């Protein structure tokens, strides 16, 4: 028996579990869109309003769910559109899979070059019979590299019948000798360390019980954040840069370091990964096992007792209260210019133990490292390595087709808002009940604070006219707020909360231009730089009561 | 004797008169930021929203003066946000230089970044050395122009804040005339045609004059490229219009009609009835290109139009011309009756209309891609002291803000309209905010069908199932307008256009200005698809189309040529 | 009514003139084999042996002749093979269409991004029916670009009927500018005209202006013979294949005028497209027309002039740099050098002969040694540079000039690289004269580590290979000389073989190095006097006077 190609190409989709899919119709993929029209039972199409959008939303798709990630764009224009969302899924590493519309065989541009370089696989179809197979090899490619797949398909292919008989939809413990001798270097350390990514998801448990057994701190990257909740008191954050200051300061002095699922005065580094290629990079390092990081975590776990309360211990314990302490002291005002550290106190107040959060690219990153308070049961993405603005909107709209019962934000800086704002509508069209919150400080804040430390000339490109999001939001008929007052704060979010449990909210924060601290510019030590430094650092920071690691480091007869 | 490689770059882009230039800064371009900073009053550096839209900017720029256009992205995805602006530049070749932040040479998302570029660009260089940077920068000028395209430049941000030596670093063809012979065979041949149309794209932008006498003095209907559109006043009375699918209902039916085609700067973007074709241009890779022709003369427009009229005179009114001339008469009086509509639900044929009645005899029209190119390719009554621009080649939609922009920047004397359905505004509409930082007084207008609508009457041509992705819920322009601080307005009567688009006309002696225009579903009449022939489709089908379209009064061309003695294409 | 779309394909290159083209087959090209077969009197198959030969010997076609040149390879590793001659042709400027089989629609490398950065216009035919007219746009680009056009062409595709029924201007002077420039050329105390191929059919022009205003004449190494080398004011060609003389006349300038082209006061310039108009140093005047009209309307406003110190200085540098060359040239016996070959070439080379030459010190010695004039051609890799060429070029040229003599010049490191294919000289009964410079060397690459490498030589002096004995091997008559005293003989068996045959000589040379131009130890006011004597002594330079001498001799400084 027959089948339109197109109908085939839906059906190796729906096999390999795609639930939605994003795009924008043209006439060079209307073929692909009849067919999409005939299943709209079995799979949802989103209509996005630009194609950018569909592709970032796809990524993030991948990136919280592991499934597949699927966004079309029209010939030309429109699968050109599709390129910061397939680039940020090539550089996380997530499978999406793109279609591009061309047009028909008999019926002028060539496609195929823009996309050699994101793709691991960037094919044209040339044979309605065959398509529904190279769209099932593009999948597995995808899944395969971890990153985009790209078929181009003229349109005249999908309205072509063919058999339905003949097309398919094609759908270890750790060495106990290293396990050993990795202990051993880890036993023996003065200052160790233990730094996860991504590649612990499944070990938060045994990260937190060998950091308490061993009295030995924690550290993530940044996308580790919440893998172990943020509330444990030997968690230092992340170091790199949306750094926090206790990891950033420890890396630094620690002699014995291990990398648990990552690959990044140590004179041992440690490392536990499941790929081969990854057991060496950044330093010379001296034990590297090859395994899974829950069980090689269990492994050191059933050979070590409770060892007592170090001198290291404790510093980074004293260092990690103070700067929480700091923290606190932001969100806790009560009245008076609103900054980003309320909107984010607001944001934990009336956060649930599960949701989610799509988070923009700029100082929202470092400002939500340090601020959202996440356990394992939390996700929160954004665009990690490509670092692409304008994801947040995206992310949400993923976040909540994925998870209809669960809560979702949006965090966005007023740049990054600006980038993707008209998919604000399709929140609304589609009902995605997210909570956006966009930082409203008229710059690219992120940005003004780079030209401060490096350039001669005055600021350029860095502060601009305001947008009234609470407008723009009222223009695609969301519900949205407008505040510039920490009193304000309460009140509104109270109002977001509940709207969301049916409807799209956007509370636009207009926020002051303050630098937030800068981990790595620390002026607090007496030694390293003026006391006048120092006072301006504490002025500027609000950071009168912060101490360096120095003075935890002595207060327990630690060297420096 | 010593400049920083930053300033000499800048002092380049100076030399060559580049006035203004777009982008976003970032840390991996914060160098070129710099020195773009310290010459703040001898280059204006325009802050965009989105980096496509300066890309667009930068083409419409190009487009419009014939000077290459400037912008630039930051590394990884600012650079990549450029490309849907330089795919337009490289279809409709306009010289554009882009530059793209990359991490220092020291430091050194490690991307390599070259790979990106190599599809779109003529010219696609990483900058190695600061001393050379200034010479890259001027080659891939020279090159973009060369070309007539794109040229990209990766910079590795420390080499713009590298000291190196001042002492290191750092036109127009006349033409000769046309072949005589060759000239006297092509005016021949055309003097010899029963039914000869001359048809002419932008190639033929210098001779509008020659256009219009040669079409005058020899009793020959005129059609254009779309971009054409305006090289002849659109007034003219044989002025067919363009073919192809912003298509006009006389250039569409007399084209099947010809014995004989002189294309002049064109070279076709069908025919049947024509037995010669005749062309002239400028490039010989030209000549030729689709299916065999016959007299082929490689020299400017211009010169050639005007030798051959140096050549011929008047002849009287032949059946082909009064024929062709009743036809368009027809036409027009049919699109005058959609805008002469004085009450009731808003068309885009009113909002059209009201621009025109609005318009300054120079204004600069930035069109977006959908409905709208039809539509104001109908509608709009231009001349040649207008300009209009649109992405013609790539097509693609967000670039009604974009171009209004780079029109305001160049000719901030000069009325500039957005002209943009809400698909096509949406995509860009950030970038309202930056009409409003930089006081550019465009006179917005969006036309607010809640449809995809071109791609709705696509899908209604060839698709089996029900319409999908070609419906969506509004979004209120006028909001979106107070929400960037811009003063705007929304209607949705045809009784409410007067008002409205005076006080627009007046905001926009000082600041910029929107109208959203909520219209109807309407399906804007196909000229490519016609049932009017009472003798080439059913009666039913005919009655159904006049219906629709509200095309009553429309006579098919055949009719025309039945009243003056000429035979049609259904008698062969 | 009905065609094959192969025959509609190969109809198509019939009709812009292409009488042959190369490749080697498979059977993801038989298709558009299948449809030459067919066509066997009508357009001319060359097999090579290796397919960059076919793509090198499509590229000198368009060199010599300014037709584009057509090659061929099979999918995958057929059109990888094509790259080195396909980047000879985008780099030196010239179009050449590439044919590249692929996989059947119907019955899977993705090929198209391999010709990506090579081609100008790079596309797979989806279609039987747009097939003829995708050949036809690529043959268009071709021309237009003035490079390489690929297609790749399903394999199912030409096997399939078809409808048969369904298949520049120079701007002249601104006579202001004109005027101009002959001012600023006039008014100079130390002028050069400096041209490169642009100037090709203006050589009367540039010799005629050279003798009136008294200016020497410089070129690229691409204009050698546009003016006759026997000219006693040609200086030769600057950078480095360099003559002596054009160098250190450059650095003694003051007024250059630049004719088809691309201490110094003023850049004067001559050029025919607008981007090139300042291109390397800053420039006055720029004329913007054609260089032969141009130097015909400058000799026109212009009038006999009298010799001047300049002049002088530079025919004396001339008289003794040629004298010099002469001297290498005219050994009579002892061990073999590549300066007697070159004589031995010089003295049976006919008036009209062709000389397809490869890359290494060939370039810089024939640069030297041959004497052409404007009935001459000669072809190389300029810009890409790639090695191996000689062959390829020489089995174009006799190809395309059956009735002129033609050699090939190659050192033994690029006669290596294509080798094989003096099988196809022999195959379409090609009589080129194919001389092979043997010094065991990369000879070129070694006198390269010497100038920069702080340790011994490596990968530049190997093993022998004999080339008669290769020639031999495809059954082509050759020889073997390692002594000056052998080369008449030998020249003249050649020459005479060559009237009906190919044939190979193997000069086996010594290792000397050729003189440096750009290397100079003559200035006992620059360099120490034992430099100097070793400097001579090395490159049998004891006549060879510095150009200062010369400036001193006339009133000249510096
Ligand atoms: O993003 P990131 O910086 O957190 O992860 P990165 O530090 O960039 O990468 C995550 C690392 O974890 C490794 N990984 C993934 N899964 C596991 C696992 N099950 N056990 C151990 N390592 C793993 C990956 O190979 C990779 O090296
Ligand atoms: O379709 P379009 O108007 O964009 O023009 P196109 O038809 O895409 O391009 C215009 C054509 O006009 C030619 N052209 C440009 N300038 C001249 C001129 N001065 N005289 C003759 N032809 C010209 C170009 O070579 C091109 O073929
Ligand atoms: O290789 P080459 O260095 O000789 O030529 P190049 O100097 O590398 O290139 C040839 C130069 O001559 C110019 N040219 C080509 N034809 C003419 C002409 N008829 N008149 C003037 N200049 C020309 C080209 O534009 C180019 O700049
Ligand atoms: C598309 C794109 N352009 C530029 C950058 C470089 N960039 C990094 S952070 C940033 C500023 C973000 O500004 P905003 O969203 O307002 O956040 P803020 O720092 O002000 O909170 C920029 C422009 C980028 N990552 N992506
Ligand atoms: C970036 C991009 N995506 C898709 C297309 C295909 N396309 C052409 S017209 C069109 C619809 C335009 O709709 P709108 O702007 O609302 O104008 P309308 O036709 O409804 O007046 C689309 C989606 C395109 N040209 N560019
Ligand atoms: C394919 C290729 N590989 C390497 C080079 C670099 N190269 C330039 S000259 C040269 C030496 C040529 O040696 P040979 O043919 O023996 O000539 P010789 O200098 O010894 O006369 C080399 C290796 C090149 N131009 N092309
Ligand atoms: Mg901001
Ligand atoms: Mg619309
Ligand atoms: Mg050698
Ligand atoms: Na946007
Ligand atoms: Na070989």
New interface residues.
Partial sequence: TNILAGAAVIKVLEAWGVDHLY?????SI??I??????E?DRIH?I?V??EEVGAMAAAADAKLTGKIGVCFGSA??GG??L??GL??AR?DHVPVLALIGQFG??GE??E???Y??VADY???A??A?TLPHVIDEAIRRAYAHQGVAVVQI?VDLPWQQIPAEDWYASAPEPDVQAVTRLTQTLLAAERPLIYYGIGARKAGKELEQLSKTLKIPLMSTYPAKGIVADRYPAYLGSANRAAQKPANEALAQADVVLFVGNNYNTRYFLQIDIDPAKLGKRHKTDIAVLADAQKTLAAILAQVSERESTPWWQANLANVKNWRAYLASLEDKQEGPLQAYQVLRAVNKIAEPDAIYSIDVGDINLNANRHLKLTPSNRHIT?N?????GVGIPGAIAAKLNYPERQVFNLAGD?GA??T??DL?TQ??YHLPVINVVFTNCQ?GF?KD??ED?????????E??????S??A????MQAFRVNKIEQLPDVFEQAKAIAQHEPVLIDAVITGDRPLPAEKLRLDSAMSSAADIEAFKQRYEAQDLQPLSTYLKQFGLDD
Avoid at 474 to 477: A, F
């Fill in positions: 795009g924008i119709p043209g006439g209307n073929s869109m009849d067919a999409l029209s005939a709209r199409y209509q309003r630009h030309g224009p050109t559109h390129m910061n680039y940020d550089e065989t008999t541009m060539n195929n070059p823009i050699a370089d960037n094919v044209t040339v044979n019979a003229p665009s390595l490509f670092a692409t603005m740049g600006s980038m704002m008209q509508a609304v069209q690219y940005i780079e030209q490096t350039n001669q000339n005055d600021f350029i490109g860095v601009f006219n305001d947008i009234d999001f407008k723009i009222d223009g695609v008929h």
